[PDB]
Design an enzyme around this catalytic site. Structure first.
Site, PDB file in Angstrom:
ATOM      1  N   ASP A 142      -8.677  -2.711   3.605  1.00 22.23           N
ATOM      2  CA  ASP A 142      -8.806  -1.411   2.961  1.00 22.23           C
ATOM      3  C   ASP A 142      -9.825  -1.422   1.835  1.00 22.23           C
ATOM      4  O   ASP A 142     -10.509  -0.414   1.627  1.00 22.23           O
ATOM      5  CB  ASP A 142      -7.456  -0.936   2.424  1.00 22.23           C
ATOM      6  CG  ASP A 142      -6.500  -0.563   3.527  1.00 22.23           C
ATOM      7  OD1 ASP A 142      -6.968  -0.387   4.669  1.00 22.23           O
ATOM      8  OD2 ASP A 142      -5.288  -0.442   3.254  1.00 22.23           O
TER       9      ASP A 142
ATOM     10  N   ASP B 182       0.855  -1.183   0.000  1.00 22.69           N
ATOM     11  CA  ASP B 182       0.000   0.000   0.000  1.00 22.69           C
ATOM     12  C   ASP B 182       0.888   1.229   0.000  1.00 22.69           C
ATOM     13  O   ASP B 182       2.010   1.180   0.508  1.00 22.69           O
ATOM     14  CB  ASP B 182      -0.946   0.044   1.203  1.00 22.69           C
ATOM     15  CG  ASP B 182      -1.832   1.283   1.195  1.00 22.69           C
ATOM     16  OD1 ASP B 182      -2.704   1.397   0.307  1.00 22.69           O
ATOM     17  OD2 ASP B 182      -1.638   2.160   2.061  1.00 22.69           O
TER      18      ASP B 182
ATOM     19  N   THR C 161      -3.744   5.659  -1.788  1.00 19.89           N
ATOM     20  CA  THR C 161      -2.378   5.726  -1.309  1.00 19.89           C
ATOM     21  C   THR C 161      -1.510   4.751  -2.065  1.00 19.89           C
ATOM     22  O   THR C 161      -0.391   5.099  -2.457  1.00 19.89           O
ATOM     23  CB  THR C 161      -2.322   5.391   0.181  1.00 19.89           C
ATOM     24  OG1 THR C 161      -2.799   4.055   0.386  1.00 19.89           O
ATOM     25  CG2 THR C 161      -3.197   6.346   0.956  1.00 19.89           C
TER      26      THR C 161
END
Lengths: 514, 127, 509
Positions: free
Chosen positions: A382, A48, A81
């Protein structure tokens, strides 16, 4: 130590690329995994953007500063991100080119904003309002998990995802701090991803065979001491008073066989049979002989619970909490239509499942129990927030750069100001957008140029949102493909990309001192 | 374990007993200095030559004719006696009281403090 | 131990870079320098006062630059960057030349005449205000808040600044000088909203009095400030021996009663309920008053009582005898224990003197309030700066380009070697315009020469370049404004500042 202006901006912009570049597949299924053995000095696996940042001890302020604001999106979306860093330095690439030719650092920073708007306006313009169904969320689930893991791995994951949020969409809560209950399990393979609409109980009772299958779950989540303790304990404890210890020996198991009977009667009140399952869960230790009395009554009486689990027990079941079992109505304890007390490995992990009115939904994964088993847990989680945004926004647009060109197009296709001045900013601004597909397409395949002129002309020809085949390098209608941007996600990181890129363009010295 | 809390309770009981005794006795010893102080006011008053009946020995009391009211004793030093003036003797009586007074005094600050700490141990006792 | 020309260099040397990097940080349009700690701690600020700090400081005149900076940080706190610009401007230009022309001296003098010409021009270039019209003031505050780019809550706090600070303004030397700030009282409050706050009369007592037995509300009992000497007198007027024994407890505590009452009856002579007891606080003092059913607020600050001295507008009374409203609790007045959030707040309102309010602040919570307060703090001071100075100037280059002409006009007319400072003085005005030209991000030499002409006919009275409008402009229409003094206050400093280091040829340890 100091570097001024131009020399200040270099260290900024120069630090971005290589840092930025590592992520050139962090997004979509093409995203390449990255292993820290070095982050704290420990073997790990991650993809990530923000997470990898914090994971590595990251020495450079450039690396340091965005992770703070990159924390925002990963807080919000959890991904992108995995994306945003890429436009940011490419944007940094753009502005210098002026100042490289020369131009005032202000006006370029200045020219990003109406650009930051007219493009954000295009977001309003491009955003595809979608009516979320599990399938739509399935492809929303897999677009974030492709970003994370195999689309293969996205598959068994996708189910629990769109299904867990499925019962929170019932709750009409657009965000999930519940049904975020996740479980990991001893396995040879992290492949297993399990979905418990209820909970899963870590602790087993020190007594096995109590009620091993609790069908009707009547759960009193109990702080109660059914272990007060059995022998000499004074307040429940040892002390310096014999005089008190002399008085305090007997009432112990009395206060216990109380709570024994308080369960005994409770069980038979809750049940009158061992047929209907029954559960007692202590936040603390229980006497096994209490259990022995109780384990033979049809209860599974459980001990040393974690106050967190008590909640989702108290809530997803609609469970309850007392210090005295007394008797309570059978219904007075929260319920799960089935409870399955489950040992994989040596520990029984009890599934209190379809907990009545679940606000929580438990996602088990069985695995090798490595950071592999971690790389799956983070992966879904996420996407959970991502797919949660699709609950939030009714507008979800496709990813794979289907957005970028058409967005980068207009403000480039026309100076949005018809200022060179803004277009200075804008041409700098509106350009960096393309970084994502153009590298991914070339990450997976042919030079960006074709797909670019494809996707542009395509969008120009279509206006349909067409996006890379993220392991090919060819544009495909990304809406139908299913690689999908929450109007939440993309819009934010857009802002995030630019909002940082300005004052950091504005660092005209840095002194090492403090 | 169990006896240690049992130990210090009635321990601090007795310091109360001891100090209350010591102030009581240091309430006692002061009282006889003014006795030595006041008996001199009487002998000045009546006169030298009055019959004094003073104890002789156990149950025995011996008489005498009063003389030298200005000649009156202060017992001080280790083994020593200063006969003093009618004025001076009454002074060190007052003195050695006051020497005993703060001697007597701080005993109750010591007296009263030892009971509540027994209590503090007695508090932990029934605890 | 440091010397002369090298000091003079180190003057120009350090004061150069001293004057500099925060001008990138200057302007509503700005450039924030990054600051790295040797550990790696990173900082992004437009604040020189902040920027002054993490940077490792050695040059002791740079320390002295930090001084007039902090000295100005004491005064305004804004322009501490801008004050050190011009001294940096000043010290740079004339010094080396005119010291290689051999003098601090003519340099020293002509800044007297650099000062006054603008001081003159200031009264010309700054225009009076309605402190009467808070809107006429508000636009300033609307302007004051936004260089550091804070509007959201401040837009209200703008008004709230106007309100109290005109009231928290009552001060007279007989020439009626108003610095009065400490009258203004601010409140950290949980809950409410940044868009809901106010100014309540007297001085609201927030900080250290939540005290629940103040009662709650005082309709018209008095509040009592004690420089008494309410301390119980164990004897008649005096404090007898301590209590080591039963006999000292009966006799002494009895006489301890009288002195409390006879003063607290003198306190009752002004008829309170609330008595906030500061000097002479006694465990019997409140207890008597609590027996008097007079809530006696102890364990308290005289700072509160100074806030309360400004809460009733009163003083605090050492007089034991005959305590008065006008002695303490001046005016009818109020006292109220209020819960804004749930925090208990004593509100002592209705000072005997009008212009009585103190700023209540509510955010959605303390923090987002502190967002208001910090910016209101700037907002509120600009008031007493506009309340200080009821003249105000079209800013930017208008402020800048105005005097240099007269200054050069002087230098041309004065045609001494003092003319040379007035030349050295002339363009030092234009550096923040350069920064303004930085702020717009444009070509300075043009805009200067362009604005130079803008003072050749227009006389740049309202005409500077405003980097935030980007262009040579009327600053009145554009509305760039500050109360005159602030301009001078920034302007006065750098003169003396430069003149300060203009004195030093010698560092010695």
């Amino acid at each position: 130590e100091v570097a001024r202006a131009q020399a200040a901006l270099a260290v900024n912009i120069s630090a971005a690329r290589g840092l930025q570049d590592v992520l050139r597949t962090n997004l979509g299924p093409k995203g390449t995994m990255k292993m820290l053995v070095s982050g704290a000095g420990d073997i790990k696996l991650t993809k990530d953007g923000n997470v990898l940042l914090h994971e590595m001890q990251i020495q450079h302020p450039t690396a340091s500063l965005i992770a703070k604001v990159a924390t925002a999106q990963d807080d919000i979306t959890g991904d992108g991100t995995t994306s945003n860093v890429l436009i940011i330095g490419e944007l940094l690439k753009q502005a210098d080119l002026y100042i490289s030719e020369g131009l005032h650092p202000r006006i370029i920073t200045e020219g990003f904003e109406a650009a930051k708007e007219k493009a954000l306006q295009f977001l309003e313009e491009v955003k595809v309002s979608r009516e979320m169904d599990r399938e739509t969320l399935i492809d929303v689930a897999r677009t974030s998990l492709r970003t994370k893991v195999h689309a293969e791995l996205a598959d068994v994951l996708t189910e629990a995802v769109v299904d867990s949020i499925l019962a929170i969409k019932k709750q009409d809560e657009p965000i999930d701090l519940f049904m975020i209950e996740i479980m990991e399990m001893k396995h040879k393979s992290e492949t297993d991803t399990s979905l418990i609409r209820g909970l899963v109980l870590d602790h087993g009772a020190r007594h096995p065979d109590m009620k091993k299958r609790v069908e009707d779950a009547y759960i009193l989540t109990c702080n109660v001491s059914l272990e007060y303790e059995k022998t000499e304990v004074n307040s429940g404890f040892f002390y310096k008073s014999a005089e008190e210890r002399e008085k305090l020996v007997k009432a112990e198991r009395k206060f216990i066989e109380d709570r024994v009977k308080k369960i005994i009667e409770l069980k038979r009140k809750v049940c009158g049979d061992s047929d209907k399952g029954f559960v007692v869960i202590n936040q603390k230790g229980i006497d096994p002989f209490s259990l022995d009395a109780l384990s033979k009554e049809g209860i599974v009486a459980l001990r040393r619970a974690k106050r967190r689990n008590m909640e989702r027990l108290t809530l997803a079941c609609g469970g309850v909490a007392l210090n005295s079992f007394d008797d309570l109505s059978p219904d007075c304890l929260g319920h799960a239509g089935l409870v399955y007390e489950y040992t994989l490995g040596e520990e029984k992990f009890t599934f209190i499942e379809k907990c009545n009115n679940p606000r929580s939904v438990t996602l088990l994964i069985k695995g090798p129990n490595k950071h592999t088993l971690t790389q799956i847990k983070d992966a879904v989680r996420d996407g959970l927030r991502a797919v949660k945004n699709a609950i939030d926004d009714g507008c979800v647009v496709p990813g794979a750069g289907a957005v970028e060109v058409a967005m980068a197009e207009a403000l480039i296709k026309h100076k949005p100001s018809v200022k060179g001045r803004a277009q200075l900013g804008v041409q700098a601004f509106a350009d960096a957008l393309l970084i994502i597909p153009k590298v991914l397409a070339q990450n997976s395949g042919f030079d960006l140029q074709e797909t670019l002129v494809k996707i542009q002309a395509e969008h120009s020809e279509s206006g349909q949102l067409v996006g890379v085949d993220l392991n090919t390098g060819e544009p495909m209608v990304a809406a139908e493909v299913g690689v999908w941007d929450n109007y939440c996600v993309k819009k934010q990181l857009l802002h995030s990309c630019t909002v940082i890129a300005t004052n950091i363009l504005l660092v005209d010295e840095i002194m090492r001192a403090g | 374990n169990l006896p240690q809390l049992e130990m210090l309770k009635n321990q601090l009981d007795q310091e109360v007993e001891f100090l209350s005794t010591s102030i009581a006795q240091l309430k006692v010893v002061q009282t006889k200095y003014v006795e030595a102080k006041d008996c001199l006011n009487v002998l000045n008053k009546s006169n030298e030559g009055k019959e004094l009946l003073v104890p002789l020995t156990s149950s025995m009391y011996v008489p005498g004719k009063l003389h030298d009211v200005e000649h009156v004793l202060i017992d001080v030093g280790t083994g020593y006696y200063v006969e003093k003036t009618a004025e001076d003797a009454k002074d060190f009586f007052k003195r050695k009281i006051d020497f005993l007074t703060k001697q007597m005094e701080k005993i109750q600050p010591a007296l009263q403090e030892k009971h509540a700490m027994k209590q503090a141990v007695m508090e932990m006792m029934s605890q | 131990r440091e010397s002369g020309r090298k000091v003079q260099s180190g003057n120009i040397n350090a004061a150069k870079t001293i004057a500099d990097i925060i001008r990138t940080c200057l302007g509503p349009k700005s450039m924030m320098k990054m600051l790295l700690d040797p550990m790696g701690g990173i900082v992004m600020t437009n604040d020189g006062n902040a920027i002054l700090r993490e940077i490792q400081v050695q040059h002791p005149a740079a320390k002295s630059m930090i001084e007039i900076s902090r000295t100005q940080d004491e005064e305004v706190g804004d322009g501490t960057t801008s004050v050190i610009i011009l001294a940096g401007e000043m010290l740079s230009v004339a010094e080396h030349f005119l010291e290689q022309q051999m003098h601090p001296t003519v340099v020293i003098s002509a800044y007297r005449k650099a000062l006054d010409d603008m001081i003159s021009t200031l009264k010309k270039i700054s225009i009076p205000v309605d402190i009467s019209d808070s809107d006429m003031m508000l636009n300033i505050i609307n302007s004051s808040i936004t260089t550091k780019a804070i509007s959201r809550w401040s837009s209200l706090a703008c008004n709230i600044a106007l309100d109290a600070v005109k009231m928290v303004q009552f001060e007279e030397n007989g020439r009626k000088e108003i610095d009065i700030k400490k009258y203004a009282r601010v409140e950290k409050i949980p809950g409410g909203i940044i868009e809901d706050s106010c100014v309540l009369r007297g001085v609201m007592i927030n900080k250290d009095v939540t005290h629940p037995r103040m009662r709650r509300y005082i309709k018209n009992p008095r509040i009592v400030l004690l420089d008494s000497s309410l301390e119980y007198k164990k004897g008649e007027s005096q404090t007898d021996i301590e209590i080591t024994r039963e006999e000292d407890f009966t006799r002494i505590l009895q006489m301890e009663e009288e002195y409390i009452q006879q003063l607290c009856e003198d306190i009752i002579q002004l008829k309170p309920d609330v008595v906030i007891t500061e000097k002479g606080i006694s465990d019997l003092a409140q207890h008597y008053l609590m027996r008097a059913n007079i809530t006696a607020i102890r364990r308290v600050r005289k700072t509160d009582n100074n806030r309360i001295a400004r809460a009733c507008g009163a003083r605090i009374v050492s007089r034991p005898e005959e305590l008065r409203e006008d002695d303490v609790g001046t005016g009818a007045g109020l006292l109220e224990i209020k819960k804004i959030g749930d925090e208990y707040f004593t509100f002592i309102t209705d000072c005997k003197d009008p212009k009585a309010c103190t700023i209540l602040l509510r955010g959605a919570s303390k923090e987002i309030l502190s967002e208001v307060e910090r910016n209101l703090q700037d907002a509120m001071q600009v008031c007493r700066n506009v309340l200080l100075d009821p003249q105000l100037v079209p800013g930017g280059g208008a402020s800048e380009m105005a005097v240099a002409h007269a200054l050069t006009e002087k230098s041309k007319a004065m045609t001494g070697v003092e003319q040379w400072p007035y030349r050295a003085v002339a363009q030092a005005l234009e550096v923040i315009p350069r920064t303004l030209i930085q702020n717009c991000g444009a070509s300075t030499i043009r805009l200067l020469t362009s604005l130079r002409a803008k003072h050749t006919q227009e006389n740049c009275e309202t005409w500077g370049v405003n980097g935030e409008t980007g262009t040579l402009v009327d600053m009145k229409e554009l509305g760039i404004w500050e109360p005159l003094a602030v301009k001078l206050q920034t302007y006065k400093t750098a003169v003396e500042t430069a003149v300060l280091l203009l004195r030093i040829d010698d560092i010695v340890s």
